[PDB]
Chain A
């Protein structure tokens, strides 16, 4: 029984597939309708092939014959070749996101704010013109009727604004704030020593988790908000019917 074991060992260490003992199958993904192709080749036992297809992880996968080490090396070769492609595409995505963010964070924000202020200014001008129109043309001395109500409202709000107390409260508040300003700044300068305790005390790990929990909350909150929004928009419909 000696020259049999030897031949069997010589057979084991070989790509000829006489019980190669390095028989493992790897599933290569292939989209339909290419499944009908592949289609093994020289020394494939339909037993192994079907048994591979039997315990299939997901559809559109075809098994691949990995006999020994050069094959697994090759599989690695491919894996790197795809690694680089993955990283590249990912970087593309990254770059386009940077572009979008650069646009928004600078080019668009400024134009939004600027446009809003321009609107306010033009609103003022619009009311000014819309006011002078009601002056020069309507200077026929016959200005009355609904004017009384207008000047009544105007007088009410104007009287409400032009009050000593209401106007005084702000002035009192400001100084009332400056008191705390000075007091706080003094008490702060006094206790302006605990810096390392503060910086190191704050810098931690729970902060990262808290950020995550915050994002989750934000998502939940957004969802709820939009849900209510829809609940409103969907109700004002029923309000008509």
Chain B
């Protein structure tokens, strides 16, 4: 009974010693689990901030693009003026187009002013009504508005998309008819 009773002890001890390792696994799980679950939330966050920067830089491109062509025409218009003086110190028919151009340009800027003015009128006339109701009256109801807006924007985008597709295909038609 000695060899047996000892063998069972050693065996059961070894098994118990293995179960200690099993438990050791069980212990080191939840922490590591949280750590793991943390990751996808961050990468799914950092990926968002990148999109923010990209939307910011891409927006910054058009800014310089505008500033590029602006200094370039100001470079030429300031150059066309000196060559006239450098010609004098040792083009009068040319600047006429430039002045008449500035005129032609401003001629619409005035129309823009008129437009915006008319809009402002049309808007404040609404402000009056809004206040006129707001004075007359004197959360959950407006939440419906947002949804009603968005579900309508979906539709509007889907409407525009058709127009866009129609145009694009309409252009490729001519493109085709060209080399066809």
Contact = CB atoms under 8 A, between A and B. Distances in A.
Contacts of B128: 180
Given A176-B124, A187-B131, A206-B146, A129 B81 contact: yes
B70 interface: yes
A105 to B, nearest CB: 7
A134 B167 CA distance: 47
Contacts of A170: 117
Task: Tell me whether chain A's interface is mostly helix, strand or loop, or mixed.
Answer: helix
A73 B171 contact: no
Contacts of A231: 164, 167-168, 171
B5 interface: no
A170 B78 CA distance: 35
A67 B52 CA distance: 47
B36 interface: yes
Contacts of A127: 77, 102
Interface in B115-152: 117, 120-121, 124, 127-128, 131, 134-135, 138-140, 143, 146-147, 150
B43 interface: yes
Contact of A76 (B32, B57, B171): B32
Contacts of A122: 74, 78
12 contacts: A86-B39, A93-B50, A126-B74, A150-B96, A154-B103, A157-B110, A190-B138, A204-B143, A217-B157, A224-B164, A234-B171, A238-B178
Interface of A: 6, 9-10, 13, 68-70, 72-73, 76, 79-80, 83, 86-87, 90, 93-94, 97, 100-101, 104-105, 108, 112, 115-116, 119, 122-123, 125-127, 129-131, 133-134, 137-138, 146-147, 149-150, 153-154, 157, 160-161, 169-170, 173, 176-177, 180, 183-184, 187, 190-191, 197-198, 201-202, 204, 206, 210, 213, 217-218, 220-221, 224, 227-228, 230-231, 234-235, 238, 241
Interface of B: 11, 14-15, 18, 21-22, 24-25, 28-29, 32, 35-36, 39, 42-43, 46, 49-50, 52-53, 55-57, 60, 63-64, 66-67, 70-71, 74, 77-78, 80-81, 84-85, 88, 92-93, 95-96, 98-100, 102-104, 106-107, 110, 117, 120-121, 124, 127-128, 131, 134-135, 138-140, 143, 146-147, 150, 153, 157, 160-161, 164, 167-168, 171, 174-175, 178
